[PDB]
Write an enzyme that holds these catalytic residues in place. Structure first.
Site, mmCIF file in Angstrom:
data_model
loop_
_atom_site.group_PDB
_atom_site.id
_atom_site.type_symbol
_atom_site.label_atom_id
_atom_site.label_comp_id
_atom_site.label_asym_id
_atom_site.label_seq_id
_atom_site.Cartn_x
_atom_site.Cartn_y
_atom_site.Cartn_z
ATOM 1 N N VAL B 30 -5.140 -0.278 -1.463
ATOM 2 C CA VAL B 30 -4.208 0.814 -1.105
ATOM 3 C C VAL B 30 -3.605 0.673 0.297
ATOM 4 O O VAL B 30 -2.467 1.087 0.508
ATOM 5 C CB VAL B 30 -4.828 2.229 -1.275
ATOM 6 C CG1 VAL B 30 -5.156 2.483 -2.737
ATOM 7 C CG2 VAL B 30 -6.063 2.439 -0.408
ATOM 8 N N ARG B 32 -3.898 -1.571 4.512
ATOM 9 C CA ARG B 32 -4.310 -2.681 5.373
ATOM 10 C C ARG B 32 -3.748 -2.468 6.788
ATOM 11 O O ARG B 32 -2.609 -2.860 7.079
ATOM 12 C CB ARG B 32 -3.850 -4.029 4.801
ATOM 13 C CG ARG B 32 -4.068 -5.199 5.775
ATOM 14 C CD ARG B 32 -4.141 -6.564 5.119
ATOM 15 N NE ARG B 32 -4.514 -7.563 6.118
ATOM 16 C CZ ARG B 32 -4.509 -8.876 5.918
ATOM 17 N NH1 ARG B 32 -4.146 -9.374 4.746
ATOM 18 N NH2 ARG B 32 -4.870 -9.692 6.900
ATOM 19 N N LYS B 52 -13.630 -0.365 2.788
ATOM 20 C CA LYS B 52 -12.965 -1.049 3.885
ATOM 21 C C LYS B 52 -13.682 -2.367 4.154
ATOM 22 O O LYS B 52 -14.855 -2.369 4.564
ATOM 23 C CB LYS B 52 -13.019 -0.174 5.136
ATOM 24 C CG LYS B 52 -12.263 -0.738 6.325
ATOM 25 C CD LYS B 52 -12.397 0.188 7.511
ATOM 26 C CE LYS B 52 -11.785 -0.431 8.752
ATOM 27 N NZ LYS B 52 -12.164 0.353 9.955
ATOM 28 N N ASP B 148 -6.748 7.364 19.448
ATOM 29 C CA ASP B 148 -5.622 6.889 18.633
ATOM 30 C C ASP B 148 -5.229 7.925 17.573
ATOM 31 O O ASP B 148 -4.971 7.569 16.430
ATOM 32 C CB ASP B 148 -5.973 5.536 17.981
ATOM 33 C CG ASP B 148 -4.743 4.797 17.427
ATOM 34 O OD1 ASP B 148 -3.616 4.957 17.959
ATOM 35 O OD2 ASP B 148 -4.913 4.042 16.449
HETATM 36 C C1 LIG Z 1 -10.152 3.621 5.348
HETATM 37 C C2 LIG Z 1 -9.278 4.874 5.464
HETATM 38 O O1 LIG Z 1 -9.578 5.530 6.697
HETATM 39 C C3 LIG Z 1 -9.493 5.824 4.288
HETATM 40 C C4 LIG Z 1 -10.762 6.377 4.015
HETATM 41 CL CL1 LIG Z 1 -12.208 6.071 4.954
HETATM 42 C C5 LIG Z 1 -10.905 7.236 2.929
HETATM 43 N N1 LIG Z 1 -9.890 7.558 2.144
HETATM 44 C C6 LIG Z 1 -8.686 7.070 2.353
HETATM 45 C C7 LIG Z 1 -8.435 6.183 3.408
HETATM 46 C C8 LIG Z 1 -7.027 5.731 3.556
HETATM 47 C C9 LIG Z 1 -6.376 4.857 2.687
HETATM 48 N N2 LIG Z 1 -5.104 4.521 2.904
HETATM 49 C C10 LIG Z 1 -4.358 4.988 3.913
HETATM 50 C C11 LIG Z 1 -4.961 5.874 4.803
HETATM 51 C C12 LIG Z 1 -6.286 6.254 4.616
HETATM 52 C C13 LIG Z 1 -4.212 6.456 5.964
HETATM 53 C C14 LIG Z 1 -2.710 6.451 5.699
HETATM 54 C C15 LIG Z 1 -2.299 5.023 5.338
HETATM 55 N N3 LIG Z 1 -3.004 4.585 4.102
HETATM 56 C C16 LIG Z 1 -2.333 3.773 3.231
HETATM 57 N N4 LIG Z 1 -2.865 3.290 2.079
HETATM 58 O O2 LIG Z 1 -1.182 3.459 3.478
#
Ligand SMILES: C[C@H](O)c1c(Cl)cncc1-c1cnc2c(c1)CCCN2C(N)=O
Lengths: 267, 346
Positions: B30, B32, B52, B148
């Site tokens: 989803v 990066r 992650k 951040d």
């Molecule tokens: C690892 C991340 O912090 C995360 C976590 Cl722990 C849990 N659920 C969703 C996410 C997550 C996935 N994707 C995105 C985001 C957040 C921010 C916005 C950007 N984003 C995309 N896919 O673009």
């Protein structure tokens, strides 16, 4: 670094890494087939000193050295000394502990150079041969250490509460250098695996007051703490110094190290 | 290792949980900033998880600190580490989290796009701000800075047991010497732009002020077009166009900032005499006598020592005024925001 400073009671240290003394002794029985109980506590003293020396060589602050020491103790609290060579584990513990800090980094060349130099200049009585491990071995060992510790990296120590207690007494100049030094000495024992750090701080401060003939009895009475547990800790500290007196690590450690159970090689 | 005990080594290897055995993630990337939307392989949950895979190999200082702090932090509005996988062969590290379907970047983008196809619900705005403050207050009380903060890092849970709960994510867990000077500027406090040498709680609060403005208007308040040096002229120009130029009395210590003389060289007070937050917010249909505005103005105070703290912001009468903030920011209403699409790009 004050990150997580007042969170001890909901910390992984407290909830996962304050162990039962009988669980500790039970797991130790496998290494007690090779070494006596005396010899086991002498080995602990030896590797505490090795970790201290590595940390001093790398100019790390006392708290980083203490964290590294706790990592070492947690590993061998669960596992036999044969599982991973303690000579490899010690610098690996220092390396990992230094990376929890964000104020400067310990490089690869600098870590290995420090392990090589400290063992040959400060520990040649125990090690005739050069530090045989390279950086790939440290990195491998690091993965095993992190796994065993269930990624519990934040470690609390008695230095912070000690500092608060002496400042509360109004006796920082008289008592802190001795009390601090005694806190360092408690890492020669199991105390850090068995009691909350603030209790260890209180015990060290008590011993420091007794050694300097300072009457702090009313100040101790004004605290709300289990003094039975403090006295338990005091007895281990007083015993530590008698053990210290009777132990010559320089004369004994080569022989004791030779009695350590050795790793089973691959088939 | 050859000198590691063989029995010890094969026992651990036999027992070690591998990420690829427990979770189906291939094709489910989803994000990066490698982030995957994963399901358990046994089918005992049917919940979605975020996996992650940390960038690089081994355990870097940044990876160490992230694991270290997440392992301790526990609060309803901070993203919660469920599990860490250590992949011994390739020396890769994987972090498991509960999956947050939404975030403020996408939510705000959806409202900004809906404005073109012709506002953000005000009960929702308040509830989001309250939960952001609650989570940041928890981090700050534990002496953990985010360093951040931006809309992309304010996650919001979808359908499930935590429906509409904020989850603060992607903290800046490692900064060398806690320094901004070591290797978007829209959410950066003016002291950073004038060369502040350390991150502070106040720097986080400014960013919350920026997010709050953006939720109220759908526009980044200090929007600006896109080096080592902290001084960014165009970003500062934008701040002053919105806020006005600070008077001496508003920020007495400005003179101490390392870039103060550069500021004096490049800028004139006279340029921004018709500029104020009041004027800016009025143009975007936010009343200056609203409790929302007065709180916003306390968050977007220029002098960091005069900026409200997270705890004081939570006590603001804004949160006692009708409508009360809700635990589900969507307040039981249908969620119109689209789910995250799986990426298939090489
Ligand atoms: C690892 C991340 O912090 C995360 C976590 Cl722990 C849990 N659920 C969703 C996410 C997550 C996935 N994707 C995105 C985001 C957040 C921010 C916005 C950007 N984003 C995309 N896919 O673009």
């Amino acid at each position: 670094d004050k990150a997580m400073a007042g969170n001890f009671w909901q910390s992984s240290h407290y909830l996962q890494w304050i162990l039962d003394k009988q669980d500790l002794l039970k797991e130790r029985q496998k290494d007690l087939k090779f070494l006596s109980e005396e010899e086991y506590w002498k080995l602990q003293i030896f590797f505490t000193n090795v970790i201290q020396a590595l940390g001093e060589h790398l100019k790390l602050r006392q708290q980083v050295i203490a964290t590294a020491t706790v990592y070492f103790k947690r590993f061998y609290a669960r596992y036999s000394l044969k599982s991973i060579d303690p000579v490899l584990m010690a610098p690996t513990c220092v390396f990992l502990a230094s990376k929890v800090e964000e104020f400067g980094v310990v490089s690869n060349t600098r870590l290995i150079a420090a392990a090589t130099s400290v063992l040959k200049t400060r520990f040649s009585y125990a090690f005739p041969k050069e530090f045989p491990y390279r950086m790939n071995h440290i990195l491998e060992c690091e993965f095993y250490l992190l796994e065993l510790m269930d990624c519990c990296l934040i470690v609390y120590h008695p230095y912070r509460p000690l500092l608060q207690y002496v400042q509360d007494m109004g006796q920082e100049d008289m008592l802190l250098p001795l009390a601090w030094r005694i806190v360092n000495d408690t890492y020669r024992t199991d105390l850090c695996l068995l009691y909350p750090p603030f209790m260890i701080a209180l015990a060290c401060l008590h011993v420091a007051c007794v050694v300097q003939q300072k009457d702090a009895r009313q100040w101790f009475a004004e605290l709300s703490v289990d003094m039975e547990k403090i006295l338990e800790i005091i007895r281990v500290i007083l015993k530590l110094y008698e053990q210290w007196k009777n132990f010559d690590e320089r004369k004994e450690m080569a022989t004791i190290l030779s009695k350590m159970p050795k790793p089973k090689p691959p088939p | 290792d050859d000198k590691m005990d063989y029995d010890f080594k094969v026992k651990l290897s036999s027992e070690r949980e591998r990420v690829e055995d427990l979770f189906e993630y291939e094709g489910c990337k989803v994000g990066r900033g490698h982030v995957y939307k994963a399901k358990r392989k046994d089918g005992k949950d049917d919940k979605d998880y975020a996996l992650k895979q940390i960038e690089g190999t081994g355990i870097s200082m940044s990876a160490c600190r992230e694991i270290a702090l997440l392992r301790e932090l526990k609060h309803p509005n901070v993203i919660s580490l469920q599990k860490v996988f250590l992949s011994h062969a390739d020396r890769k590290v994987w972090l498991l989290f509960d999956y947050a379907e939404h975030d403020l970047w996408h939510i705000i983008k959806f409202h900004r796009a809906s404005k073109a196809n012709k506002q953000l619900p005000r009960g929702m705005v308040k509830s989001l701000l309250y939960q952001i403050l609650d989570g940041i207050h928890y981090l700050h009380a534990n002496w953990v800075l985010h360093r951040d903060l931006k809309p992309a890092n304010i996650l919001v849970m979808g359908e499930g047991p935590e429906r509409g709960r904020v989850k603060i994510a992607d903290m800046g867990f490692a900064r060398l010497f806690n320094s901004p000077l070591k290797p978007t500027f829209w959410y950066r406090a003016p002291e950073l732009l004038l060369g502040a040498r350390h991150y502070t709680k106040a720097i986080d609060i400014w960013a919350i002020g920026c997010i709050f403005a953006e939720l109220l208007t759908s526009e980044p308040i200090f929007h600006c077009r896109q080096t080592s040096n902290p001084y960014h002229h165009d970003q500062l120009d934008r701040i002053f166009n919105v806020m006005g130029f600070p008077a001496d009395k508003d920020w007495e210590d400005i003179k101490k900032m390392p870039e103060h003389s550069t500021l004096m060289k490049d800028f004139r007070r006279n340029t921004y005499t018709n500029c104020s937050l009041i004027k800016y917010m009025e143009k975007h249909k936010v009343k200056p006598d609203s409790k929302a505005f007065h709180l916003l103005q306390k968050l977007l105070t220029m002098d960091p020592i005069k900026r409200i703290t997270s705890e004081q912001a939570m006590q603001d009468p804004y949160f006692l005024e009708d409508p009360l903030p809700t635990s589900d920011v969507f307040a039981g209403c249908q969620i119109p925001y689209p789910k995250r699409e799986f990426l298939t790009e090489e």
